[PDB]
């Protein structure tokens, strides 16, 4: 460990450019395992209305989706606007 | 319109209308001489543009003479024998086309080999049109 | 040169045929053809003699022109049809451009001119990949379009490849150029049966690799560039002389051996097509291949040629070159005529 | 041959953008998506040779939708007959095609 | 329509340019690059007229194998030009042996 | 529209000549001289006299040249540099181009073509060395130019140049990207071809590089496109990496903040021009490709990493 | 601060896009009422134009199915003026 | 708008070229219009084969240009549902783009 | 601007003719930069602003590097221009005479075929969606990051192996 | 080959709405909160029939609902809506980052003189079930006749009859 520590210590003294590129590349490697916000961008891109979501036909099985837009029961975004 | 012109050879039977028949095979010999001289120019380049245009004119003239003598002797044999369904009428025309080939290249052994090969090629062409199974078949099995 | 680069380029020349097989989009199998082209060109120019640089640049301009005419056909099919896959109800012009550029990328006559010139540049350890493994990639498109092609243009290209591969290997006495015109003649054979049976042109392609890969291993072990250099086998190594006798006669396609079964099954599925004159012109003109392979027979095996005094040096020195693959693909080619119903 | 690697594995490396009616980046429709979807749903389970005979009306209708060739001929003929009637004098100057029209909305 | 017919006339003239050789093989590489440029223009007007956004990176992979193939040919012409001095295709007459 | 393109294009030519004036004045102040203050009221008349005098300077049609390409190069360079200015955002852009920074990157890649056209068509060996080192400056600058213009614009998330104005109202952009600003600065020195990274018009390397055979008005057009590119990419570094205050009711306060920040950035551009020794293209390709290319790729990796690290992705 | 600005800017885009997603069927009812009106103006001024030329029905569509084919830019505004045609087909693209 | 600013810009640059040409006097001679190599007779023609040595770095520029062209749709690619898919695969793509330069820097390709 | 893309594609045919009659490749690089700019505004008039502009950037960079290559290696003592040889300029005159004859025979001789010259302007883009937001082609090019990931992986591995190809060849 | 059918101009003309961008987008949340049954009903008509000629009455009464909404916001709260659109129309970006301090005045007006609730973040992008009086068509695509499949072969796999059937082998 001491030989490789003296190798990476002298590389950061002499030519630190490639080893700091490798350091922040390894930081980008170890980012999304411990990133807590990494499961929010995909559902934000799901929640943006680029298309028209087609309103479904009412058949009266269960109220899994709301029959009215502005009432807050249903799939909301109130934990996303508070971010 | 080229294929409709070239298919005027077949629906008129042999023994009649020799001028249109020799026009069709003269045009066929000219087209085959044009593509053979184009291959000869693109294989062996001439030293001059005048030499290249003399090469394509000489090869087109000799192959058109081969086709014209083949169709002329074929229709002359059809006149003198009155047998439109005879492969010997194409054998004599193919031998005369090979003799025209060997007279134009000035070698009598090549004239005899061209007589034998072009006569059996014209005999197989007339007999292949007589039985009717095509040289280029549609895929049917 | 570097083994990391050689492992990458060997994986690339493996992958390009694999992706031109696996990709069912014809744009992505054009991508596989381009992969095979770009992967095999540094292995053409690896020896860096000027004859191989000339062979690599003639190869590059010919397969680049073929790849761009193929890409013209795929983008023209996206204009006319709107889908990527070649449907049955498209025109004949795009399929004829596809056939002409695939024929030029293969090596069928009258685009035969680049193939002896490309195999003259390089020794045969890469020329196996250049001559045989560059037939897996352009014939991976023709199976996918197998009832779509114009059969007159198919059989015209096949008869010009039979005629010109018979007529181009006679005078020219280099071994790689003889095997190139052998590949042009057997290219005409396995593109003759293309609009009728795809399994039999797959069979004839497989018979060509299992014929020619022990042939190029036998030339690879001894570096026999010329007719006299393969005639020197009876002083250098007389072990493969008896096997090269049967393998040259099988690549002739004489009846008791394996290479009869290509011409026998092509005549079998062409007389079922009521194709008389073109099939007999195909089968009559294949004997000039047997003329220059009997010249190969006469130089190698059945007449011992004059050898040199430095052949006793090769007699003294031990030999450890050829693998198990030479013997097993040699016998597993040439003595499988009782396994003839189990191949089709 | 075909060699069916994606068909064996079940994962579409390039099969999911083969036709014009494939899935799109945020669902923006290709032109004649309905026509190509009707042609593919016609063409499934019939094969290519019988698809040529049976879905000929649907292939010609989809090909007319994409190339718009008889639509181009129809617009060219109505513009030529409008030009000939304008030289003749039967045609009035169009108020809805002369720029003086009431625009909706 | 008319733009695509002028595109395929430009492609036919680019094929007529790249199926002959006049001065250098570098100008044939230039003809292949113009050929694949008009091929790109064909691909983009088809994938933009059909309003298909799925087949839109097919011009990207067409340009990728275009400029990679031209890159391969430029290293090839580097090797044949520093071998031969000048890169004329009329000096390439030692492969008939 | 015509009054707008006159008040955009004629004051940018007058301000480019006055930039040449204050370039020579603050350059001579760096070199302890007072500068050209005699011929104008505190020297406000000298590059106007240069642009006047180079009109009736004699142009050159040499024997060895091709005169059509030789005269089509500097007119394309002037049209290039003066029509690169139109997708600049400002308060409100004259061209509201939807992906205009790719047009900026494409026409600055076109900016290293007229110099090669000039260096070939001049038909001198000196101009051919200047043209080959312009190719070497392309080989140096272009991929790090695109990666710095890609990765920090991924934090804005759009190639519309108008959307960068609303991004940095309260804070600057060199505070989230400080190595990207200085690496953008040393790559835009290579695109701008100023005296750290000037390697294709240098009096100590060649006889002024690619301007060997170019006299008079075409040399005035090349100098015009040169200093238009200087103030142009000073405004590019100003409009990307530093964020002025935006009030939507008052764009004039934003414009004078642009004025003071662009004057200090053009002052540090001609200060960094007149300070340093001038490179050699071996270590130009070496420090960019070996050192600063994987640092741009690794901060490009970290800009891949940032919108999944936090906050979602930027707007369209 | 880029995190806070990116989250408030995505909230701003989703607010403006929520205004768009509530505004589309007013736009869509405007859209089909115009593109049926300009096609009916094409059908009205087809019977004036080609009543003399035979075997050509007015209101004819070459598509075989009875489903609503989407009208093109050429079939929609092809009978109108060249200025309105260029403003239609070059509208978003040349507003530059 | 972009067409008319390109048109009026090339027209003003063309009339700058015309007022460069036709405004001074016109008198040339052969010693004046001889080419410049610090004032000497031509030892060789300038159009001759130049064997420059940055050729592999130039083709690495062409491949890196192609690589940044596939890198270029990234602000639209970040607006997708498959963020982890484009994340892992774009990480792989720019990693092998760095690894090609790492092999060139190892095997002395940039000299 | 009704005949805009038709006069641009005619300029494309003139530039590809100037490339096709094959001068010394310096003039071919100038004419192909002209035709690449022509194809850039050809795609940039259609509606997809990303594609033709990034291939304008690519063709500017790659044409600049092959332009440095053809002023480095592939040149001779007397460079053949378009006007230096009268076969090239006479073939240019014959080619523009042939394209005048081609638009003549497609304009008023027979007027039979899929190619039409009376259909100018209106048959340029067939249907573009007017109310939608995601109509810019950048997300369509960016579809290779999400849906068409395999050809993206294939092209990235192709340029990795191409870097290995050029370092194998040029040693 | 047939003749297309379109409604007449008197049917296609309506009580036409001429309402600009800032007055649309300023109360676009307030439009969609108070027209949503009609709004998603007309959108479900368009999405399930794929046809402009089958939704003329729904388009007429959604324009009647829109004109009732705009007459209501004219008659009740005119002054903060006129200040809100004349200050939102100054910004050419027309996002809601420039108008919140008078949007609060518009919210004060709609709570005082109207009593509505403005819809909050992320609620107008949801799918909606709305009751339709129209019966669902069995072929909404107007598709043609379905072609038959290939007649499949079923049963036990018998072996190859009398050998391998290749010439003289058995």
UniProtKB/Swiss-Prot annotation, chain D:
Protein topology in the membrane: Peripheral membrane protein
Gene label: Ndufs5
Protein name according to UniProt: NADH dehydrogenase [ubiquinone] iron-sulfur protein 5
UniProt free text on domains: Contains two C-X9-C motifs that are predicted to form a helix-coil-helix structure, permitting the formation of intramolecular disulfide bonds.
InterPro entries: NADH_UbQ_OxRdtase_FeS-su5
A GO biological process held by the record: proton motive force-driven mitochondrial ATP synthesis
Subunit (UniProt): Mammalian complex I is composed of 45 different subunits. This is a component of the iron-sulfur (IP) fragment of the enzyme.
Its job: Accessory subunit of the mitochondrial membrane respiratory chain NADH dehydrogenase (Complex I), that is believed not to be involved in catalysis. Complex I functions in the transfer of electrons from NADH to the respiratory chain. The immediate electron acceptor for the enzyme is believed to be ubiquinone.
UniProtKB/Swiss-Prot annotation, chain G:
Localisation per UniProt entry: Mitochondrion inner membrane; Nucleus
Principal location listed in the UniProt entry: mitochondrion
Entry GO CC: cytoplasm; mitochondrial inner membrane; mitochondrion; nucleoplasm; nucleus; respiratory chain complex; respiratory chain complex I
Keywords attached to this entry: Acetylation, Apoptosis, Electron transport, Membrane, Mitochondrion, Mitochondrion inner membrane, Nucleus, Respiratory chain, Transmembrane, Transmembrane helix, Transport
Record-level GO BP terms: aerobic respiration; cellular response to interferon-beta; cellular response to retinoic acid; extrinsic apoptotic signaling pathway; mitochondrial respiratory chain complex I assembly; negative regulation of DNA-templated transcription; positive regulation of execution phase of apoptosis; positive regulation of protein catabolic process
Molecular-function GO terms, alphabetical: ATP binding
Membrane topology: Single-pass membrane protein
Family: Belongs to the complex I NDUFA13 subunit family.
Subunit and partners: Complex I is composed of 45 different subunits. Interacts with CARD15, but not with CARD4. Interacts with STAT3, but not with STAT1, STAT2 and STAT5A. Interacts with OLFM4.
Protein name per UniProt: NADH dehydrogenase [ubiquinone] 1 alpha subcomplex subunit 13
Organism of origin: Mus musculus (Mouse)
Shown chain mapped onto the complete sequence: 49 to 144 of 144
Curated annotation (Swiss-Prot), chain I:
Enzyme nomenclature, EC number: 7.1.1.2
Presence of the UniProt keyword 4Fe-4S in the record: no
Enzyme class: translocase
Keywords: Electron transport, Membrane, Mitochondrion, Mitochondrion inner membrane, NAD, Respiratory chain, Translocase, Transmembrane, Transmembrane helix, Transport, Ubiquinone
Recorded topology in the membrane: Multi-pass membrane protein
Localization terms from the record: Mitochondrion inner membrane
GO MF term set: NADH dehydrogenase (ubiquinone) activity
Catalytic reactions on record: a ubiquinone + NADH + 5 H(+)(in) = a ubiquinol + NAD(+) + 4 H(+)(out)
Any one cellular-component term (Gene Ontology): mitochondrion
Keyword Electron transport: yes
Main function: Core subunit of the mitochondrial membrane respiratory chain NADH dehydrogenase (Complex I) which catalyzes electron transfer from NADH through the respiratory chain, using ubiquinone as an electron acceptor. Essential for the catalytic activity and assembly of complex I.
Family: Belongs to the complex I subunit 6 family.
Stated name of the protein: NADH-ubiquinone oxidoreductase chain 6
UniProt gene name: Mtnd6
Swiss-Prot record, chain J:
CHCH domain residues: 32-73, 74-117
Top-rank taxon, per record: Eukaryota
Annotated membrane topology: Peripheral membrane protein
Motif annotated as Cx9C motif 4, chain positions: 99-109
Motif (Cx9C motif 3): 77-87
Motif annotated as Cx9C motif 2, chain positions: 55-65
PROSITE patterns: CHCH (PS51808)
Purpose: Accessory subunit of the mitochondrial membrane respiratory chain NADH dehydrogenase (Complex I), that is believed not to be involved in catalysis. Complex I functions in the transfer of electrons from NADH to the respiratory chain. The immediate electron acceptor for the enzyme is believed to be ubiquinone.
Protein name: NADH dehydrogenase [ubiquinone] 1 alpha subcomplex subunit 8
């Amino acid at each position: 460990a001491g030989r490789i520590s003296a190798f990476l210590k002298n590389a950061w003294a002499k030519e630190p450019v490639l080893v700091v590129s490798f350091s922040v590349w390894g930081l980008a490697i170890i980012m999304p395992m411990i990133s807590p916000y990494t499961k929010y961008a995909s559902m934000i891109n799901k929640a943006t209305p680029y298309n028209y979501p087609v309103p479904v036909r009412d058949d009266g099985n269960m109220p899994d989706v709301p029959s009215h837009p502005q009432d807050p029961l249903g799939p909301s975004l109130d934990w996303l606007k508070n971010l | 319109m080229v294929k409709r012109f070239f298919e005027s050879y077949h629906e008129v039977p042999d023994g009649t209308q020799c001028h249109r028949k020799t026009y069709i095979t003269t045009a066929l010999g000219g087209i085959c001489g044009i593509i053979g001289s184009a291959y000869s120019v693109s294989l062996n380049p001439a030293d001059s543009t005048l030499e290249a245009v003399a090469r394509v004119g000489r090869y087109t003239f000799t192959a058109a003479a081969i086709g014209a003598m083949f169709g002329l002797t074929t229709c002359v044999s059809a006149q003198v024998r009155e047998k439109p369904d005879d492969p010997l009428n194409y054998f004599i025309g193919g031998c005369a086309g090979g003799l025209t080939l060997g007279a134009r290249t000035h070698s009598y052994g090549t004239a005899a080999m061209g007589c034998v090969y072009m006569g059996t090629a014209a005999a197989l062409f007339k007999i292949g049109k007589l039985e009717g199974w095509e040289l280029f078949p549609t895929p049917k099995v | 040169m570097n083994p990391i680069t050689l492992a990458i380029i060997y994986f690339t020349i493996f992958l390009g045929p694999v992706i031109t097989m696996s990709s069912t989009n014809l744009m992505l199998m054009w991508v596989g053809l381009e992969f095979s082209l770009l992967a095999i060109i540094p292995m053409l120019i690896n020896k860096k003699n000027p004859r191989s640089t000339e062979a690599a640049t003639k190869y590059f301009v010919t397969q680049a022109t073929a790849s761009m005419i193929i890409l013209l056909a795929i983008v023209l099919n996206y204009k006319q049809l709107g889908t990527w896959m070649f449907q049955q109800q498209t025109n004949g012009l795009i399929l004829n451009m596809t056939l002409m550029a695939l024929s030029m990328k293969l090596g069928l006559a009258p685009f035969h001119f680049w193939l002896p010139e490309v195999t003259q540049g390089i020794p045969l350890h890469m020329g196996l990949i250049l001559l045989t493994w560059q037939k897996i990639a352009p014939l991976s498109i023709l199976i996918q379009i197998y009832p779509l092609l114009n059969s007159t243009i198919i059989l015209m290209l096949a008869i010009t490849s039979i005629f010109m591969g018979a007529w181009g290997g006679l005078n020219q006495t280099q071994m790689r150029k003889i095997m190139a015109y052998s590949s042009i003649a057997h290219m005409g054979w396995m593109l003759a049966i293309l609009p009728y049976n795809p399994s039999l042109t797959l069979l004839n392609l497989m018979i060509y690799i299992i014929l020619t890969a022990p042939m190029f291993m036998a030339l690879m072990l001894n570096n026999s560039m010329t007719i006299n250099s393969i005639s020197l086998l009876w002083n250098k190594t007389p072990a493969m002389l008896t096997m090269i006798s049967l393998m040259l006669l099988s690549l002739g396609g004489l009846p008791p051996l394996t290479g009869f079964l290509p011409k026998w099954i092509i005549i079998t599925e062409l007389m079922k097509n009521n194709c008389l004159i073109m099939a007999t012109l195909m089968a009559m003109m294949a004997l000039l291949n047997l003329f220059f392979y009997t010249r190969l027979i006469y130089s190698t095996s059945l007449t011992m040629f004059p050898t040199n005094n430095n052949s006793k040096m090769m007699t003294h020195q031990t030999k450890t070159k050829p693998n198990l693959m030479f013997s097993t693909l040699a016998i597993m080619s040439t003595m499988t005529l009782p396994l003839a119903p189990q191949l089709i | 041959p075909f060699l069916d690697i994606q068909k064996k594995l079940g994962i579409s490396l390039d099969r999911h953008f083969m036709f014009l009616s494939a899935e799109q980046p945020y669902k923006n429709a290709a032109r004649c998506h309905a026509f190509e979807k009707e042609w593919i749903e016609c063409a499934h389970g019939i094969g290519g040779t019988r698809a040529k005979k049976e879905c000929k009306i649907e292939f010609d209708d989809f090909e007319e939708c994409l190339l718009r060739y008889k639509t181009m001929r129809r617009m060219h003929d109505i513009k030529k007959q409008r030009e000939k009637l304008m030289k003749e004098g039967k045609y009035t100057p169009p108020p809805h095609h002369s720029g003086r029209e009431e625009p909706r909305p | 329509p008319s733009t695509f017919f002028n595109l395929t006339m430009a492609f036919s003239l680019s094929l007529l340019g790249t199926l002959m050789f006049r001065s250098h093989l570098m100008s044939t590489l230039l003809c292949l690059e113009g050929m694949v440029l008009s091929l790109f223009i064909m691909t983009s007007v088809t994938s933009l007229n059909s309003n298909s956004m799925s087949s839109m990176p097919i011009p990207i992979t067409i340009l990728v194998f275009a400029a990679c193939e031209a890159a391969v040919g430029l290293a090839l012409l580097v090797k044949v030009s520093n071998t031969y001095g000048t890169d004329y295709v009329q000096n390439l007459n030692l492969l008939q042996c | 529209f015509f009054i707008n393109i006159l008040t955009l294009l004629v004051p940018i030519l007058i301000a480019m000549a006055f930039l040449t004036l204050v370039e020579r004045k603050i350059l001579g102040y760096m070199q302890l001289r007072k500068g050209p203050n005699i011929v104008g009221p505190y020297g406000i008349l000298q590059p106007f006299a240069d642009a006047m005098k180079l009109f009736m300077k004699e142009p050159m049609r040499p024997l060895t040249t091709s005169m059509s390409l030789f005269i089509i190069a500097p007119t394309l360079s002037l049209t290039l540099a003066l029509s690169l200015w139109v997708p600049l955002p400002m308060p409100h852009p004259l061209i509201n181009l939807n992906l205009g920074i790719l047009f900026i990157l494409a026409t600055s890649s076109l900016s290293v073509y007229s110099i090669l056209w000039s260096g070939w068509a001049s038909n001198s060996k000196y101009s051919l060395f200047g043209a080959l080192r312009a190719v070497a400056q392309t080989i140096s600058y272009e991929v790090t130019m695109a990666i710095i213009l890609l990765s920090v614009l991924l934090m804005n998330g759009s190639y519309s140049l108008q959307t960068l104005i609303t991004t940095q109202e309260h804070m600057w952009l060199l505070l989230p990207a400080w190595p990207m600003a200085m690496m953008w600065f040393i790559s835009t020195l290579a695109e701008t071809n100023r005296a750290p990274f000037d390697l294709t018009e240098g009096e100590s390397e060649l006889v002024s590089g690619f301007n060997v055979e170019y006299a008079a008005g075409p040399f005035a057009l090349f100098f015009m496109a040169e200093y238009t590119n200087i103030i142009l990419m000073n405004a590019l570094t100003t409009i990307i990496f530093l964020g002025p205050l935006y009030y939507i009711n008052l764009p004039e306060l934003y414009s004078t903040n642009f004025m003071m920040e662009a004057l200090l950035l053009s002052s540090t551009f001609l200060w960094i021009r007149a300070s340093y020794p001038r490179f050699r293209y071996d270590q130009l390709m070496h420090l960019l490709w070996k050192n600063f290319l994987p640092l741009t790729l690794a901060l490009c990796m970290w800009h891949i990493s940032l919108p999944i690290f936090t906050a979602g992705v930027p707007p369209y | 601060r880029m995190m806070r600005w990116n989250q408030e800017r995505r909230r701003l885009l989703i607010e403006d896009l929520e205004a768009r997603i509530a505004l589309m069927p007013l736009f869509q009812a405007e859209k089909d009422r115009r593109t049926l009106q300009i096609l009916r103006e094409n059908l009205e001024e087809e019977a004036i134009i080609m009543k003399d030329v035979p075997n050509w029905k007015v209101g004819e569509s070459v598509f075989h199915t009875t489903r609503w084919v989407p009208p093109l830019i050429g079939e929609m505004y092809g009978l109108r003026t060249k200025e309105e045609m260029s403003n239609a087909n070059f509208g978003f693209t040349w507003y530059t | 708008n972009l067409y008319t600013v390109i048109f009026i810009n090339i027209l003003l640059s063309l009339t700058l070229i015309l007022v460069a040409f036709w405004l001074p006097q016109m008198n040339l001679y052969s010693e004046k219009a001889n080419p410049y190599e610090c004032g000497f007779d031509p030892t060789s023609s300038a159009r001759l084969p130049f064997s420059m040595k940055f050729f592999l770095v130039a083709i690495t520029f062409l491949l890196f240009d192609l690589e940044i062209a596939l890198l270029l749709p990234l602000p639209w690619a970040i607006q997708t549902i498959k963020t982890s898919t484009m994340m892992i695969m774009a990480f792989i793509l720019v990693t092998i783009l760095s690894l090609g330069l790492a092999y060139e820097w190892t095997q002395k390709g940039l000299e | 601007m009704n005949n805009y893309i038709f006069v641009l594609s005619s300029l494309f045919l003139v530039g590809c003719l100037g490339l096709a009659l094959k001068p010394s490749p310096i003039y071919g690089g100038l004419g192909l930069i002209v035709s690449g700019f022509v194809g850039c505004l050809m795609v940039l008039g259609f509606g997809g602003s990303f594609l033709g502009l990034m291939v304008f950037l690519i063709y500017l960079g790659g044409m600049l590097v092959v332009f440095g290559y053809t002023t480095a290696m592939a040149t001779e003592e007397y460079p053949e221009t378009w006007g230096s040889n009268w076969l090239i300029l006479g073939f240019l005159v014959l080619g523009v005479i042939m394209e005048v004859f081609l638009i003549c025979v497609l304009n008023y001789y027979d007027e039979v075929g899929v190619i039409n010259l009376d259909g100018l302007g209106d048959w340029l883009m067939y249907e573009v969606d007017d109310v939608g937001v995601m109509l810019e082609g950048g997300i369509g090019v960016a579809a290779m990051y999400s849906c068409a990931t395999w050809m993206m992986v294939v092209a990235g591995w192709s340029l990795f192996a191409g870097i290995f190809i050029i370092i194998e060849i040029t040693r | 080959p047939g003749i297309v059918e379109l409604p007449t101009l008197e049917e296609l003309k309506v009580e036409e709405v001429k309402v600009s961008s800032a007055v649309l987008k300023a109360a676009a949340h307030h439009y969609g909160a108070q027209c949503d049954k009609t709004n998603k009903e007309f959108m479900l008509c368009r999405w399930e029939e794929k046809d402009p000629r089958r939704c003329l009455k729904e388009g007429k009464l959604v324009n009647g609902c829109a004109l009732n909404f705009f007459r209501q916001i004219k008659s009740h709260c005119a002054e903060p809506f006129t200040e809100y659109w004349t200050c939102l129309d100054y910004s050419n970006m027309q996002l809601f980052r420039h108008c919140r301090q008078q949007q609060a005045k518009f919210d004060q007006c709609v709570l005082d003189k109207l009593g509505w609730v403005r819809p909050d973040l992320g609620q107008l992008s949801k799918v909606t079930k709305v009751k339709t009086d129209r019966p669902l068509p069995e072929n909404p695509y107007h598709s043609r006749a379905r072609p038959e499949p290939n007649p499949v072969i079923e049963g036990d796999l018998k072996p190859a009859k009398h050998g391998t059937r290749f010439f003289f082998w058995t």
